[PDB]
Design a protein around this ligand. Structure first.
Ligand SMILES: *[C@@H]1O[C@H](CO[C@@H]2O[C@@H](C)[C@@H](O)[C@@H](O)[C@@H]2O)[C@@H](O[C@@H]2O[C@H](CO)[C@@H](O[C@@H]3O[C@H](CO[C@H]4O[C@H](CO)[C@@H](O)[C@H](O)[C@@H]4O)[C@@H](O)[C@H](O[C@H]4O[C@H](CO)[C@@H](O[C@@H]5O[C@H](CO)[C@@H](O)[C@H](O)[C@H]5NC(C)=O)[C@H](O)[C@@H]4O[C@@H]4O[C@H](CO)[C@@H](O[C@@H]5O[C@H](CO)[C@H](O)[C@H](O)[C@H]5O)[C@H](O)[C@H]4NC(C)=O)[C@@H]3O)[C@H](O)[C@H]2NC(C)=O)[C@H](O)[C@H]1NC(C)=O
Ligand SMILES: *[C@@H]1O[C@H](CO[C@@H]2O[C@@H](C)[C@@H](O)[C@@H](O)[C@@H]2O)[C@@H](O[C@@H]2O[C@H](CO)[C@@H](O[C@@H]3O[C@H](CO[C@H]4O[C@H](CO[C@@H]5O[C@H](CO)[C@@H](O[C@@H]6O[C@H](CO)[C@H](O)[C@H](O)[C@H]6O)[C@H](O)[C@H]5NC(C)=O)[C@@H](O)[C@H](O)[C@@H]4O)[C@@H](O)[C@H](O[C@H]4O[C@H](CO)[C@@H](O)[C@H](O)[C@@H]4O)[C@@H]3O)[C@H](O)[C@H]2NC(C)=O)[C@H](O)[C@H]1NC(C)=O
Ligand SMILES: *[C@@H]1O[C@H](CO)[C@@H](O[C@@H]2O[C@H](CO)[C@@H](O[C@@H]3O[C@H](CO)[C@@H](O)[C@H](O)[C@@H]3O)[C@H](O)[C@H]2NC(C)=O)[C@H](O)[C@H]1NC(C)=O
Ligand SMILES: *[C@@H]1O[C@H](CO)[C@@H](O[C@@H]2O[C@H](CO)[C@@H](O)[C@H](O)[C@H]2NC(C)=O)[C@H](O)[C@H]1NC(C)=O
Ligand SMILES: *[C@@H]1O[C@H](CO)[C@@H](O[C@@H]2O[C@H](CO)[C@@H](O)[C@H](O)[C@H]2NC(C)=O)[C@H](O)[C@H]1NC(C)=O
Ligand SMILES: *[C@@H]1O[C@H](CO)[C@@H](O[C@@H]2O[C@H](CO)[C@@H](O)[C@H](O)[C@H]2NC(C)=O)[C@H](O)[C@H]1NC(C)=O
Ligand SMILES: *[C@@H]1O[C@H](CO)[C@@H](O[C@@H]2O[C@H](CO)[C@@H](O)[C@H](O)[C@H]2NC(C)=O)[C@H](O)[C@H]1NC(C)=O
Ligand SMILES: *[C@@H]1O[C@H](CO)[C@@H](O[C@@H]2O[C@H](CO)[C@@H](O)[C@H](O)[C@H]2NC(C)=O)[C@H](O)[C@H]1NC(C)=O
Ligand SMILES: *[C@@H]1O[C@H](CO)[C@@H](O[C@@H]2O[C@H](CO)[C@@H](O)[C@H](O)[C@H]2NC(C)=O)[C@H](O)[C@H]1NC(C)=O
Ligand SMILES: *[C@@H]1O[C@H](CO[C@@H]2O[C@H](CO)[C@@H](O)[C@H](O)[C@H]2NC(C)=O)[C@@H](O)[C@H](O)[C@H]1NC(C)=O
Ligand SMILES: *[C@@H]1O[C@H](CO[C@@H]2O[C@@H](C)[C@@H](O)[C@@H](O)[C@@H]2O)[C@@H](O)[C@H](O)[C@H]1NC(C)=O
Ligand SMILES: *[C@@H]1O[C@H](CO[C@@H]2O[C@@H](C)[C@@H](O)[C@@H](O)[C@@H]2O)[C@@H](O)[C@H](O)[C@H]1NC(C)=O
Ligand SMILES: *[C@@H]1O[C@H](CO)[C@@H](O)[C@H](O)[C@H]1NC(C)=O
Ligand SMILES: *[C@@H]1O[C@H](CO)[C@@H](O)[C@H](O)[C@H]1NC(C)=O
Ligand SMILES: *[C@@H]1O[C@H](CO)[C@@H](O)[C@H](O)[C@H]1NC(C)=O
Ligand SMILES: *[C@@H]1O[C@H](CO)[C@@H](O)[C@H](O)[C@H]1NC(C)=O
Ligand SMILES: *[C@@H]1O[C@H](CO)[C@@H](O)[C@H](O)[C@H]1NC(C)=O
Ligand SMILES: *[C@@H]1O[C@H](CO)[C@@H](O)[C@H](O)[C@H]1NC(C)=O
Ligand SMILES: *[C@@H]1O[C@H](CO)[C@@H](O)[C@H](O)[C@H]1NC(C)=O
Ligand SMILES: *[C@@H]1O[C@H](CO)[C@@H](O)[C@H](O)[C@H]1NC(C)=O
Ligand SMILES: *[C@@H]1O[C@H](CO)[C@@H](O)[C@H](O)[C@H]1NC(C)=O
Ligand SMILES: *[C@@H]1O[C@H](CO)[C@@H](O)[C@H](O)[C@H]1NC(C)=O
Lengths: 134, 430, 109, 44, 143, 120
């Protein structure tokens, strides 16, 4: 369905904004989400991922610790907050849904540790753009 | 509101789909039969069948593991009963054959038998044209057919070959579901799914282009296949109104013995007594004609124009094949595939004594000769047909696995998992 | 892990079959019984669209001439009778583990 | 025809499964598996 | 014994007063006659293909019986049929209401509703109650 | 098997010895695995038949337990001290062997399938 973002634009280094991706119709708490970054004239870079219950969060190593993601399954929103901005972060951000459905976490019997399954993407939002310069 | 508490119920009526390993149940003695294998759990004539109320359960008759399980087992039963017997390795020598329709049975004279080393033994023998091959380098002089093919191994003569119904029972805690829709396509859902513990009788009959002793579809004539508009998926014709056949070996066929194994005697045709009369079969010409029209009506509900044509389908794969009293018949069934739809039918039969496998590579069993005259009768209830894409129908090849798909087409295997929980208002007082 | 591909440029005209392969360093076979390699396409100036999710199955709105195969390390996407609107890029995307990477995107003119 | 190694291809009579007549052959044989036997000229 | 597999959960507890339709009684009336010693009146006469399969058949009759007794044995619910626990139901497992589970539902569909969540409930009985109550019982014997 | 000649009120003091040595006896096979277990597996199944059957009979763990089932004298009307201080156990089994499975359904139903409808 409908899948866009908001809050894009252009800021300075050292700044901090937060985007807002909003989904339309599918049950949002059922699915995990992602973030991808296409640099202009380059390929794609994976950014982040959230579990369906907003419990599991995995970041890329380059943007590790700087950014922030979150969910609101009632408001059907999707946030990518960012901190300590650098000029090479200037690219196209895209909000994207997992292709398959995901289940609840698994809890293997032999060790009391849950498991959140993660598979790839089908619906890319057209996405905003953030530029970091002077 | 009431804070709900967890309650464990043992004995909930649930299941899933599963795979398993099965075991026989014979309903009955010296235990020397290849299939029956009276070292087997005896049955129970209890009627155990439990009917359900509200079940919609998809089956399949091709992706059901119960039929792939037999084909890895009935070749194991038939090869355990073949290993301890004598090999026929010194028989593959130079032959010298002559004839006494034309000359079919062959007075052959090979002349070594190494019971010892120094003194090899000349020998008298009687063979068949379905077992010997010509050699191109001299005058008339033969050899067995499958020398350079595989190890020809004689079956021991004190064995048996009769089909005896083998009730597959699931092991305990499992169950077998069974549908009871008369109009069942073979692969859809069902409505009345009954539950048994152990299936019905399955005669382990081996044959090709037909089925013998079968089962009975009821009230009409059922045709099943998966991909109709593909030529690949073979249609299977089950019947009511069990069509009877007689087949016979009108000869006497005394057998002699030849000592080749030191303690292991080789058996061959000693001499025939009487008149050389070809083996054949008899079919009632009336019932066969009445039966085929009943098929075409169901054919014209899946091929309802471009009218149905019968045409007949290498000596092995083209011929009709079956066993009769531990004796294997190859019968020319050309006559039964002549008509289209807009007294006593005699079919000729040939006899081969070197059978092949199901995969037909790596082993070759040799039948021993049987004294006396052989009579067998059986109900023809199953027909194998293939389309080509008016519509023409050939009988088909020899994929023996397809036999039991006409006999397991109501059965799946489940796993009773009787433990499960549900919430309610009642808490255990600690 | 590392996963690149080849060839970068295939400037063609319609009417012929060809194929694009993506080469894997780490072998992919998850314990579910499947190999998490996802092939899809963007157009220039557009967010991408899914061609095939698995190397076996396809997606809705996909012509039948888009076939893919491969081993645990070899991976191949074949396009029979390459269609006129096959412009843009073709990214090979894997989903073994994190961080899940991409290819460069093979340009097809 | 194109060290000690594959120089020798050989020949011998054998009658394995036909059990009627022997037949000579040709093979390819390395070293490390043959022995020049006694009281004979180049026999392995 | 599967006679109410199309019935509803609010109604299948009525006929479950029979001992899960005498569930385990069908085993003992089987293994009294599975242990017909005609197997010992032959020593099977050989080792046969069937006796290989019967041996692999009796083991699964042994094991899968034990895995259902042990789990009932550990849950403080040994040998009973309907026992309650102390574990509070979490609505995150199923947001179905009360009557829809009982009055308006089969069983096998309800399996696929919580077959994901089933394993979490297994740990959340033992370590929440049956590990827990035994210590608190032993404290009440300290006095 | 020591009290096999005792009366039924007397042989009850050796019930513990019979139960213990039913399973595996004394342990044979002194770890000599140097150089073919169906009989070993059956003995467990004989054991697990009975413990489950005492579990259905509400009487796991015990050796002697009561009931709510009254006797039906058509089984055997032989009265109390006619047998109890007069007869061994081999003979009491040869009075009730025809009625054996009939006793087992009644103990199943009217003692625990009954008392399942008293739980509430
Ligand atoms: C228990 O756990 C298991 C998983 O764990 C398992 O068990 C554990 C114990 C572990 O062992 C673990 O390892 C095990 O795996 C859970 O199983 C999961 O179940 C879900 C279902 O609940 C499965 O999801 C589905 O998967 C398919 C693909 O999967 C296939 O392959 C797998 C394996 O290969 C098979 O098992 C499976 O059966 C399939 O064959 C996926 O495609 C499905 O998504 C589509 O359908 C839904 C339903 O419509 C869509 O959701 C809708 O979206 C719209 C849009 O916003 C909303 O408006 C609707 O509200 C919403 N919902 C509904 C009900 O409609 C979903 O978006 C998607 O829809 C398709 O979307 C595309 C893109 O938009 C669209 O394509 C478009 O087409 C048009 C026209 O052609 C244009 O061309 C467009 O351009 C084009 O993009 C297409 O048309 C849409 N189709 C439809 C019909 O809408 C579905 O999610 C999941 O696979 C499965 N497994 C796993 C591993 O997760 C199980 O759920 C758990 N149990 C419980 C109780 O939770
Ligand atoms: C019924 O089941 C429920 C669900 O069960 C769940 O699923 C099952 C299948 C099974 O796997 C269960 O194991 C599993 O729990 C039960 O619900 C769970 O309840 C427990 C309580 O015991 C919850 O645990 C709490 O977890 C919280 C989150 O911890 C995560 O996050 C921490 C950091 O938090 C993050 O902070 C950033 C700050 O920026 C947030 O970002 C903002 O987000 C905004 C909204 O989107 C906005 O976008 C902003 O832009 C953005 O900046 C971010 O959102 C936030 N994360 C989350 C998830 O909100 C990490 O430090 C931590 O490692 C973990 O990653 C904790 O905060 C919380 O601690 C607090 O609460 C305590 C008690 O309330 C309090 O004492 C503490 O002092 C502290 O304040 C808990 O630890 C668990 O999350 C629940 N599960 C789920 C899925 O939510 C339920 O309990 C059960 N019913 C019953 C009766 O038991
Ligand atoms: C071919 O099929 C027909 C019908 O399907 C078979 O006829 C039926 O055969 C069974 C046993 O062979 C008969 O049961 C027996 O009936 C006699 C009647 O006197 C009874 O005395 C026996 O105790 C036993 O119950 C059954 O009645 C019979 N059906 C009819 C209508 O007569 C036939 O046996 C099959 N033949 C072959 C070679 O497959
Ligand atoms: C095969 O058997 C025939 C029949 O005995 C052999 O032919 C005979 O050879 C002798 C020797 O000269 C003659 O005296 C006979 O008249 C022949 N009889 C016939 C019918 O031809 C023959 O030698 C045997 N061997 C082979 C290899 O054919
Ligand atoms: C078949 O060929 C065999 C030859 O092997 C014939 O056997 C000979 O029979 C005569 C008597 O009729 C004997 O004196 C010979 O010693 C036999 N030769 C053998 C056994 O090698 C036999 O007569 C032929 N015909 C039939 C019908 O068997
Ligand atoms: C068994 O097959 C026979 C042969 O077709 C069936 O009898 C005929 O069925 C057709 C189709 O219903 C009718 O048109 C004919 O009138 C029937 N009789 C005759 C003499 O041809 C029969 O219905 C099938 N079922 C049973 C239970 O006998
Ligand atoms: C039944 O078989 C026929 C083949 O004779 C199938 O029809 C075609 O199958 C090919 C195989 O991929 C497809 O490419 C065509 O599009 C099919 N044609 C039509 C008109 O459907 C048919 O799909 C098969 N049906 C089933 C249920 O397997
Ligand atoms: C096949 O052989 C059987 C013999 O088993 C024949 O059955 C006999 O048929 C006659 C009718 O001509 C009856 O009077 C006899 O009672 C039947 N006897 C038995 C034992 O069945 C049958 O007729 C033969 N032919 C066909 C076509 O089946
Ligand atoms: C089955 O028998 C028929 C009998 O007509 C065979 O058909 C013809 O047989 C004559 C021999 O007199 C041959 O000359 C013809 O060439 C045969 N016709 C055809 C079309 O081949 C038929 O060959 C037999 N088939 C088998 C498999 O035994
Ligand atoms: C589903 O099947 C049952 C089966 O009932 C049996 O039908 C055979 C028919 O020959 C009869 O001989 C048996 O006596 C019947 N009973 C038993 C206990 O085996 C039917 O009764 C249902 O009506 C069927 N359901 C539908 C919808 O047809
Ligand atoms: C096998 O026999 C050998 C003897 O064979 C003869 O001697 C050698 C030197 C060669 O000339 C060979 O070609 C001859 O036929 C033994 O040397 C050897 O140890 C034996 N191997 C065993 C006993 O394993
Ligand atoms: C339950 O039975 C339903 C029929 O009645 C419906 O029940 C309530 C819960 C409402 O949904 C209302 O629409 C009807 O009166 C079936 O429709 C339904 O499939 C059944 N199964 C469920 C809910 O799991
Ligand atoms: C060899 O015997 C066959 C059989 O009669 C015959 O046809 C052939 O002519 C014989 N060979 C010679 C050279 O006569
Ligand atoms: C049998 O009927 C079902 C519907 O009841 C249908 O889906 C199925 O395809 C049919 N079988 C065949 C082989 O067509
Ligand atoms: C078969 O039929 C033929 C003639 O139809 C007859 O001569 C022969 O005796 C019959 N044989 C049997 C076994 O019925
Ligand atoms: C042949 O096709 C026509 C076209 O629908 C149909 O009316 C007719 O019934 C078909 N013939 C048969 C025998 O079904
Ligand atoms: C049967 O098949 C053969 C195969 O060539 C064909 O020539 C013949 O026309 C078909 N029909 C009849 C009636 O023989
Ligand atoms: C082996 O043969 C060669 C050439 O044929 C000859 O020179 C040599 O003397 C022979 N050796 C013997 C016979 O030992
Ligand atoms: C080996 O074969 C050659 C062939 O020309 C022959 O000259 C030589 O004598 C043979 N030697 C032996 C030992 O057989
Ligand atoms: C066995 O017999 C003797 C004498 O008849 C008796 O005193 C003894 O008590 C008997 N044994 C039991 C267990 O009663
Ligand atoms: C048990 O007692 C009842 C009366 O309550 C009687 O009808 C029945 O015959 C008795 N049981 C037997 C097996 O005789
Ligand atoms: C016990 O039974 C025997 C059996 O004959 C009898 O002789 C004896 O008197 C009985 N004793 C008592 C105390 O009833």
């Amino acid at each position: 369905v409908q899948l866009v973002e908001s809050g894009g634009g252009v800021v300075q280094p050292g700044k901090s904004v937060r985007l807002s991706c909003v989904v339309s119709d599918f049950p949002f708490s059922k699915y995990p989400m992602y973030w991808v970054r296409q640099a202009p004239g380059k390929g794609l870079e994976w950014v982040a991922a959230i579990s369906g219950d907003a419990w599991h969060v995995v970041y890329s190593n380059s943007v590790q610790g700087r950014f922030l993601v979150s969910r609101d399954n009632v408001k059907n929103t999707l946030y990518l907050e960012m901190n300590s901005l650098k000029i090479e972060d200037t690219a196209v951000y895209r909000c994207a849904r997992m292709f398959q459905e995901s289940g609840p976490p698994r809890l293997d019997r032999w060790s009391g540790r849950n498991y959140y399954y993660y598979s790839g993407m089908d619906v890319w939002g057209q996405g905003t753009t953030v530029t970091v310069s002077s | 509101a009431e804070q709900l508490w967890v309650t464990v119920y043992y004995g909930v009526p649930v299941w899933k789909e599963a795979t398993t390993t099965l075991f026989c149940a014979s309903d009955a003695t010296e235990v020397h039969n290849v299939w029956a294998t009276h070292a087997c759990v005896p049955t129970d004539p209890n009627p155990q069948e439990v009917v359900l109320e509200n079940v919609t359960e998809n089956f399949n008759m091709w992706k059901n593991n119960m039929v792939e399980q037999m084909h890895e087992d009935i070749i194991s039963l038939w090869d355990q009963s073949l290993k301890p017997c004598v090999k026929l390795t010194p028989l593959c020598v130079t032959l010298n054959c002559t004839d006494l329709e034309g000359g079919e049975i062959k007075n052959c004279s090979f002349n070594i038998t190494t019971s010892m080393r120094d003194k090899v033994q000349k020998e008298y023998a009687l063979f068949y044209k379905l077992d010997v091959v010509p050699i191109k380098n001299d005058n008339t002089s033969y050899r067995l057919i499958s020398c350079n093919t595989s190890v020809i191994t004689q079956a021991c003569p004190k064995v048996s070959f009769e089909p005896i119904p083998i009730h597959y029972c699931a092991p305990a805690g499992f169950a077998i579901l069974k549908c009871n829709d008369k109009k069942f396509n073979g692969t859809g859902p069902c409505t009345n799914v009954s539950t048994v513990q152990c299936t019905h009788g399955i005669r382990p009959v081996v044959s090709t282009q037909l089925l013998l002793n079968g089962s009975l579809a009821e009230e009409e004539v059922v045709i099943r296949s998966a991909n109709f508009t593909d030529n690949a998926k073979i249609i299977i014709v089950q019947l009511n109104k069990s069509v009877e056949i007689n087949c016979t070996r009108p000869n006497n066929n005394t057998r002699k013995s030849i000592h080749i194994g030191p303690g292991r005697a080789f058996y061959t045709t000693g001499e025939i007594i009487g008149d050389i009369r070809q083996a054949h079969c008899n079919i009632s010409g009336t019932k066969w004609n009445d039966t085929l029209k009943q098929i075409v009506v169901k054919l014209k509900e899946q091929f309802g124009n471009k009218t149905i044509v019968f045409n007949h389908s290498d000596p092995e794969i083209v011929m009709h094949s079956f066993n009769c009293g531990g004796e294997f018949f190859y019968c020319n069934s050309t006559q039964l595939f002549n008509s289209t739809w807009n007294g006593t039918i005699v079919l000729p039969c040939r006899i081969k004594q070197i059978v092949n496998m199901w995969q037909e590579v790596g082993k070759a069993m040799y039948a021993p000769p049987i004294k006396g005259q052989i009579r067998c009768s059986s109900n023809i209830t199953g027909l194998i047909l293939i389309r080509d894409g008016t519509e023409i129908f050939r009988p088909g090849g020899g994929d023996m696995r397809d036999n039991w798909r006409s006999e397991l087409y109501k059965y799946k295997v489940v796993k009773i998992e009787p433990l499960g929980i549900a919430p309610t208002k009642a808490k255990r007082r600690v | 892990i590392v996963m690149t591909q080849t060839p970068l440029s295939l400037s063609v005209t319609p009417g012929q079959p060809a194929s694009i392969s993506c080469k894997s360093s780490e072998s992919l076979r998850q314990s579910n019984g499947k190999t998490s390699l996802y092939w899809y396409r963007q157009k220039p100036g557009q967010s991408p669209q899914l061609l095939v999710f698995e190397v076996s199955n396809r997606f809705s709105g996909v012509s039948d001439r888009f076939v893919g195969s491969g081993s645990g390390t070899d991976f191949t996407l074949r396009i029979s009778r390459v269609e006129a609107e096959d412009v843009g890029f073709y990214y090979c995307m894997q989903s073994k583990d994190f961080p899940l990477t991409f290819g460069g995107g093979t340009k097809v003119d | 025809r194109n060290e000690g190694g594959e120089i020798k291809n050989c020949s011998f009579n054998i009658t394995t499964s036909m059990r009627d007549k022997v037949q000579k052959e040709y093979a390819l044989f390395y070293k490390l598996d043959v022995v020049p036997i006694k009281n004979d000229n180049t026999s392995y | 014994f599967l006679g109410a597999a199309g019935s509803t959960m609010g109604a299948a507890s009525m006929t479950l007063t029979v001992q899960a339709r005498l569930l385990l009684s069908g085993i003992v009336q089987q293994q009294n006659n599975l242990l017909r010693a005609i197997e010992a009146q032959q020593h099977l006469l050989q080792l046969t293909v069937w006796g290989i399969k019967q041996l692999q058949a009796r083991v699964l009759a042994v094991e899968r019986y034990l895995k259902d007794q042990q789990l009932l044995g550990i849950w403080g619910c040994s040998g009973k049929l309907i026992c309650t626990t102390a574990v509070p139901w979490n609505t995150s497992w199923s947001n179905k209401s009360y009557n829809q589970i009982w009055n308006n539902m089969t069983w096998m569909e309800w399996e696929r509703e919580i077959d994901n969540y089933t394993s979490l409930i297994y740990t959340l009985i033992e370590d929440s109650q049956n590990q827990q109550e035994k210590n608190e019982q032993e404290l009440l014997e300290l006095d």
